[PDB]
Write an enzyme that holds these catalytic residues in place. Structure first.
Site, PDB file in Angstrom:
ATOM      1  N   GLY A   1      12.727  95.989 106.673  1.00 43.60           N
ATOM      2  CA  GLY A   1      13.711  96.202 105.627  1.00 43.60           C
ATOM      3  C   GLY A   1      13.369  95.629 104.266  1.00 43.60           C
ATOM      4  N   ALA A   2      12.233  94.974 104.083  1.00 42.86           N
ATOM      5  CA  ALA A   2      11.767  94.452 102.816  1.00 42.86           C
ATOM      6  C   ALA A   2      10.833  95.446 102.120  1.00 42.86           C
ATOM      7  CB  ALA A   2      11.036  93.120 103.015  1.00 42.86           C
ATOM      8  N   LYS A   3      10.716  95.291 100.803  1.00 44.06           N
ATOM      9  CA  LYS A   3       9.894  96.132  99.930  1.00 44.06           C
ATOM     10  C   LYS A   3       8.607  95.390  99.543  1.00 44.06           C
ATOM     11  CE  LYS A   3      14.201  98.178  98.448  1.00 44.06           C
ATOM     12  NZ  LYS A   3      15.219  98.202  97.358  1.00 44.06           N
ATOM     13  N   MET A   4       7.481  96.058  99.613  1.00 44.69           N
ATOM     14  CA  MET A   4       6.156  95.496  99.423  1.00 44.69           C
ATOM     15  C   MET A   4       5.502  96.110  98.195  1.00 44.69           C
ATOM     16  SD  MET A   4       3.073  95.187 102.186  1.00 44.69           S
ATOM     17  CE  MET A   4       1.569  94.311 101.860  1.00 44.69           C
ATOM     18  N   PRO A   5       5.079  95.338  97.193  1.00 45.25           N
ATOM     19  CA  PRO A   5       4.354  95.941  96.062  1.00 45.25           C
ATOM     20  C   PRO A   5       3.065  96.626  96.508  1.00 45.25           C
ATOM     21  CG  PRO A   5       5.062  93.706  95.552  1.00 45.25           C
ATOM     22  CD  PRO A   5       5.226  93.883  97.043  1.00 45.25           C
ATOM     23  N   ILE A   6       2.897  97.867  96.078  1.00 42.29           N
ATOM     24  CA  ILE A   6       1.800  98.697  96.530  1.00 42.29           C
ATOM     25  C   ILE A   6       0.474  98.281  95.871  1.00 42.29           C
ATOM     26  CG2 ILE A   6       3.243 100.665  97.073  1.00 42.29           C
ATOM     27  CD1 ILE A   6       2.181 102.167  94.714  1.00 42.29           C
ATOM     28  N   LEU A   7       0.548  97.471  94.820  1.00 49.02           N
ATOM     29  CA  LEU A   7      -0.686  96.897  94.256  1.00 49.02           C
ATOM     30  C   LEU A   7      -0.662  95.386  94.409  1.00 49.02           C
ATOM     31  CD1 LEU A   7      -3.407  97.321  92.802  1.00 49.02           C
ATOM     32  CD2 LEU A   7      -2.122  97.723  90.731  1.00 49.02           C
TER      33      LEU A   7
ATOM     34  N   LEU B   1      -3.353  91.637  94.397  1.00 53.42           N
ATOM     35  CA  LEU B   1      -4.600  90.987  94.018  1.00 53.42           C
ATOM     36  C   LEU B   1      -5.305  90.412  95.237  1.00 53.42           C
ATOM     37  CD1 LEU B   1      -6.398  90.102  91.565  1.00 53.42           C
ATOM     38  CD2 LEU B   1      -5.311  87.841  91.809  1.00 53.42           C
TER      39      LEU B   1
ATOM     40  N   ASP C   1      -2.957  88.806  98.043  1.00 51.79           N
ATOM     41  CA  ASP C   1      -3.495  88.795  99.398  1.00 51.79           C
ATOM     42  C   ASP C   1      -4.415  87.591  99.617  1.00 51.79           C
ATOM     43  OD1 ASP C   1      -3.983  90.391 102.011  1.00 51.79           O
ATOM     44  OD2 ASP C   1      -6.007  89.835 101.323  1.00 51.79           O
TER      45      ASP C   1
ATOM     46  N   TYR D   1     -10.560  82.131 103.637  1.00 54.72           N
ATOM     47  CA  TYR D   1     -11.161  82.315 102.316  1.00 54.72           C
ATOM     48  C   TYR D   1     -11.373  80.983 101.601  1.00 54.72           C
ATOM     49  CZ  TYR D   1      -9.572  87.249 102.822  1.00 54.72           C
ATOM     50  OH  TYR D   1      -9.367  88.522 103.305  1.00 54.72           O
TER      51      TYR D   1
ATOM     52  N   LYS E   1      -3.137  85.316 106.463  1.00 53.95           N
ATOM     53  CA  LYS E   1      -3.667  85.847 107.701  1.00 53.95           C
ATOM     54  C   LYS E   1      -4.095  84.704 108.625  1.00 53.95           C
ATOM     55  CE  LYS E   1      -5.604  89.409 104.783  1.00 53.95           C
ATOM     56  NZ  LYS E   1      -6.299  88.635 103.700  1.00 53.95           N
TER      57      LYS E   1
ATOM     58  N   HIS F   1      -5.595  88.293 111.501  1.00 49.28           N
ATOM     59  CA  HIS F   1      -6.666  88.738 110.620  1.00 49.28           C
ATOM     60  C   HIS F   1      -7.649  89.714 111.259  1.00 49.28           C
ATOM     61  CE1 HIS F   1      -9.061  87.013 106.953  1.00 49.28           C
ATOM     62  NE2 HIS F   1      -9.363  88.300 107.068  1.00 49.28           N
TER      63      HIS F   1
HETATM   64  N1  LIG Z   1      -8.319  91.910 106.222  1.00 51.41           N
HETATM   65  C1  LIG Z   1      -9.604  91.657 106.122  1.00 51.41           C
HETATM   66  O1  LIG Z   1     -10.405  91.637 107.052  1.00 51.41           O
HETATM   67  C2  LIG Z   1     -10.171  91.880 104.699  1.00 51.41           C
HETATM   68  C3  LIG Z   1     -11.577  92.155 104.545  1.00 51.41           C
HETATM   69  C4  LIG Z   1     -12.132  92.384 103.247  1.00 51.41           C
HETATM   70  C5  LIG Z   1     -11.251  92.313 102.129  1.00 51.41           C
HETATM   71  N2  LIG Z   1      -9.860  92.013 102.360  1.00 51.41           N
HETATM   72  C6  LIG Z   1      -8.962  91.728 101.151  1.00 51.41           C
HETATM   73  O2  LIG Z   1      -9.133  92.838 100.263  1.00 51.41           O
HETATM   74  C7  LIG Z   1      -9.525  92.382  98.913  1.00 51.41           C
HETATM   75  C8  LIG Z   1     -10.337  93.440  98.184  1.00 51.41           C
HETATM   76  O3  LIG Z   1     -11.597  93.625  98.914  1.00 51.41           O
HETATM   77  P1  LIG Z   1     -12.991  92.985  98.476  1.00 51.41           P
HETATM   78  O4  LIG Z   1     -12.829  91.632  97.876  1.00 51.41           O
HETATM   79  O5  LIG Z   1     -13.902  93.145  99.638  1.00 51.41           O
HETATM   80  O6  LIG Z   1     -13.611  93.953  97.349  1.00 51.41           O
HETATM   81  P2  LIG Z   1     -13.116  95.001  96.236  1.00 51.41           P
HETATM   82  O7  LIG Z   1     -11.743  94.657  95.792  1.00 51.41           O
HETATM   83  O8  LIG Z   1     -13.395  96.318  96.745  1.00 51.41           O
HETATM   84  O9  LIG Z   1     -14.220  94.710  95.114  1.00 51.41           O
HETATM   85  C9  LIG Z   1     -14.283  93.432  94.477  1.00 51.41           C
HETATM   86  C10 LIG Z   1     -15.519  93.474  93.533  1.00 51.41           C
HETATM   87  O10 LIG Z   1     -15.249  94.406  92.537  1.00 51.41           O
HETATM   88  C11 LIG Z   1     -15.335  93.874  91.235  1.00 51.41           C
HETATM   89  N3  LIG Z   1     -14.396  94.487  90.361  1.00 51.41           N
HETATM   90  C12 LIG Z   1     -13.013  94.342  90.327  1.00 51.41           C
HETATM   91  N4  LIG Z   1     -12.397  95.069  89.452  1.00 51.41           N
HETATM   92  C13 LIG Z   1     -13.439  95.760  88.849  1.00 51.41           C
HETATM   93  C14 LIG Z   1     -13.372  96.711  87.812  1.00 51.41           C
HETATM   94  N5  LIG Z   1     -12.277  97.137  87.191  1.00 51.41           N
HETATM   95  N6  LIG Z   1     -14.612  97.236  87.407  1.00 51.41           N
HETATM   96  C15 LIG Z   1     -15.835  96.865  87.985  1.00 51.41           C
HETATM   97  N7  LIG Z   1     -15.874  95.921  89.010  1.00 51.41           N
HETATM   98  C16 LIG Z   1     -14.640  95.396  89.412  1.00 51.41           C
HETATM   99  C17 LIG Z   1     -15.075  92.403  91.433  1.00 51.41           C
HETATM  100  O11 LIG Z   1     -15.738  91.619  90.428  1.00 51.41           O
HETATM  101  P3  LIG Z   1     -15.125  90.295  89.723  1.00 51.41           P
HETATM  102  O12 LIG Z   1     -14.243  89.605  90.683  1.00 51.41           O
HETATM  103  O13 LIG Z   1     -16.392  89.529  89.256  1.00 51.41           O
HETATM  104  O14 LIG Z   1     -14.366  90.826  88.475  1.00 51.41           O
HETATM  105  C18 LIG Z   1     -15.755  92.130  92.794  1.00 51.41           C
HETATM  106  O15 LIG Z   1     -17.177  91.986  92.719  1.00 51.41           O
HETATM  107  C19 LIG Z   1     -10.243  91.032  99.284  1.00 51.41           C
HETATM  108  O16 LIG Z   1     -10.463  90.212  98.159  1.00 51.41           O
HETATM  109  C20 LIG Z   1      -9.288  90.476 100.350  1.00 51.41           C
HETATM  110  O17 LIG Z   1      -8.093  90.003  99.677  1.00 51.41           O
HETATM  111  C21 LIG Z   1      -9.282  91.797 103.613  1.00 51.41           C
HETATM  112  O1  LIG Z   2     -12.435  88.928 107.302  1.00 49.84           O
HETATM  113  C1  LIG Z   2     -12.481  89.084 106.096  1.00 49.84           C
HETATM  114  O2  LIG Z   2     -11.396  89.106 105.312  1.00 49.84           O
HETATM  115  C2  LIG Z   2     -13.824  88.977 105.416  1.00 49.84           C
HETATM  116  S1  LIG Z   2     -14.842  87.787 106.356  1.00 49.84           S
HETATM  117  C3  LIG Z   2     -15.190  88.787 107.778  1.00 49.84           C
HETATM  118  N1  LIG Z   2     -15.723  89.939 107.825  1.00 49.84           N
HETATM  119  N2  LIG Z   2     -15.787  90.302 109.189  1.00 49.84           N
HETATM  120  C4  LIG Z   2     -15.275  89.300 109.802  1.00 49.84           C
HETATM  121  C5  LIG Z   2     -14.937  89.378 111.229  1.00 49.84           C
HETATM  122  C6  LIG Z   2     -14.249  88.509 111.957  1.00 49.84           C
HETATM  123  C7  LIG Z   2     -14.246  89.133 113.291  1.00 49.84           C
HETATM  124  C8  LIG Z   2     -14.932  90.247 113.084  1.00 49.84           C
HETATM  125  N3  LIG Z   2     -15.201  91.159 114.011  1.00 49.84           N
HETATM  126  O3  LIG Z   2     -15.864  92.054 113.432  1.00 49.84           O
HETATM  127  O4  LIG Z   2     -14.867  91.130 115.199  1.00 49.84           O
HETATM  128  O5  LIG Z   2     -15.388  90.468 111.856  1.00 49.84           O
HETATM  129  O6  LIG Z   2     -14.879  88.319 109.001  1.00 49.84           O
END
Ligand SMILES: NC(=O)c1ccc[n+]([C@@H]2O[C@H](COP(=O)([O-])OP(=O)(O)OC[C@H]3O[C@@H](n4cnc5c(N)ncnc54)[C@H](OP(=O)(O)O)[C@@H]3O)[C@@H](O)[C@H]2O)c1
Ligand SMILES: O=C(O)CSc1nnc(-c2ccc([N+](=O)[O-])o2)o1
Length: 315
Positions: A9-15, A17, A43, A48, A77, A110
């Site tokens: 029931g909560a709202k999540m910003p679609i963009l 950081l 995020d 991290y 996470k 995560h």
């Molecule tokens: N759930 C998980 O397993 C998981 C895994 C991976 C990522 N994530 C989350 O998702 C987020 C986004 O993914 P990500 O960090 O892998 O990479 P990303 O957002 O796809 O790319 C980040 C890269 O893009 C650059 N960048 C940003 N805006 C730009 C623009 N307008 N023009 C040119 N380059 C630009 C950044 O540089 P600068 O920072 O130098 O500006 C950085 O090197 C993560 O930070 C994390 O919060 C979650």
């Molecule tokens: O997790 C992030 O946000 C970036 S750091 C990362 N990349 N891949 C892993 C991970 C943990 C377990 C697995 N797995 O693949 O089973 O992969 O950790």
């Protein structure tokens, strides 16, 4: 609209950081700038190693009354070494303490893979295989559900769960709360049509990570595809008078996804937010979808023998 309704029931910003790889010395200012220029979702993750510094920014902007707590949507996470039911609350509490929050808007598992608890985030045996935990997805989920019932988190979810693992939670005996979100890698080289449709058909919101292809990923390779430099995507951007990054951010927005681009560069933080003033055509969308090559930024090889490794399956 700027937000999407979750099944709690909560709202999540679609963009939001992203903060993975944001140096601890730069992420406080990055988050301050993001909130100043309109971001309302951050995020985060314990793994991290920068949640204290993110928290410093959030607290400054609350104190300055730039934003109200209820207007922010803070996501973190549960790391792999904390899947044990007895470790989950502490892990959440550490994150809350670092972020200087009394609740999280969303807490995600995560990865589906549980690791041996300890100081090490990737505990290894001697061959480099990660040492698993014998805890399974469903007991961990029950522990996530307790966090809701204790007021520490408003919503719970999952990340990097494949179709069969989402389905396993949905079918958990005695399930009390469905996952609100599944956060997965998604971009024109990994379009995820099957998993996204399944998730949305079940009322689970999908968040797209690495939407720019994570050009700063530690294991990048020159031969690797680069979204940001793809002439086909630059062309769509030129047509619309936008940057390639802005097209890459708008693309998941129009698939009803949440998207979390990372930057610590003030100008790019601002640029990345200016995506609510233009529309990609359906042709543009279908064209971007056509670039799929099942290319992943995030597939750690060190966990490929783990029983819950999510990416053997077709999706
Ligand atoms: N759930 C998980 O397993 C998981 C895994 C991976 C990522 N994530 C989350 O998702 C987020 C986004 O993914 P990500 O960090 O892998 O990479 P990303 O957002 O796809 O790319 C980040 C890269 O893009 C650059 N960048 C940003 N805006 C730009 C623009 N307008 N023009 C040119 N380059 C630009 C950044 O540089 P600068 O920072 O130098 O500006 C950085 O090197 C993560 O930070 C994390 O919060 C979650
Ligand atoms: O997790 C992030 O946000 C970036 S750091 C990362 N990349 N891949 C892993 C991970 C943990 C377990 C697995 N797995 O693949 O089973 O992969 O950790």
């Amino acid at each position: 609209a700027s937000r999407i309704l979750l099944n709690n029931g909560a709202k999540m910003p679609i963009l939001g950081l992203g903060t993975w790889k944001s140096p601890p010395g730069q992420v406080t200012e990055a988050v301050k700038v993001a909130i100043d220029v309109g971001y309302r979702h951050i995020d985060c993750a314990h793994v991290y190693q920068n949640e204290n510094e993110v928290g410093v920014a959030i607290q400054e902007k609350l104190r300055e009354q730039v934003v109200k707590r209820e207007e922010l949507f803070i996501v973190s996470k549960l790391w792999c070494t904390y899947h044990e039911k007895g470790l989950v609350k502490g892990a959440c509490q550490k994150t809350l303490s670092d972020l200087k929050l009394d609740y999280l808007d969303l807490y995600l598992i995560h990865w589906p893979t549980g690791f041996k608890p300890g100081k090490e985030f990737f505990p290894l045996d001697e061959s480099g295989n990660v040492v698993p935990s014998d805890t399974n997805i469903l007991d961990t989920w029950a522990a996530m559900e307790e966090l809701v019932d204790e007021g520490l988190v408003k919503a719970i979810g999952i990340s990097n769960f494949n179709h069969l693992q989402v389905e396993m939670i949905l079918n958990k005996p005695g399930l009390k709360y469905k996952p609100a979100v599944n956060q997965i890698e998604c971009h024109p080289y990994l379009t995820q049509e099957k998993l996204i449709q399944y998730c949305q058909s079940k009322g689970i919101v999908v968040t797209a990570y690495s939407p720019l292809g994570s050009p700063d990923r530690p294991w990048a390779k020159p031969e690797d595809p680069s979204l940001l430099e793809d002439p086909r995507i630059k062309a769509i951007a030129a047509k619309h008078n936008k940057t390639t990054a802005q097209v890459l951010i708008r693309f998941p927005m129009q698939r009803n996804l949440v998207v979390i681009p990372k930057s610590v560069t003030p100008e790019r933080i601002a640029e990345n937010f200016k995506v609510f003033d233009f529309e990609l055509s359906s042709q543009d969308m279908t064209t971007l979808l056509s670039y799929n090559r099942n290319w992943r930024v995030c597939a750690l090889l060190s966990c490929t023998s783990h029983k819950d490794y999510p990416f053997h399956e077709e999706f």
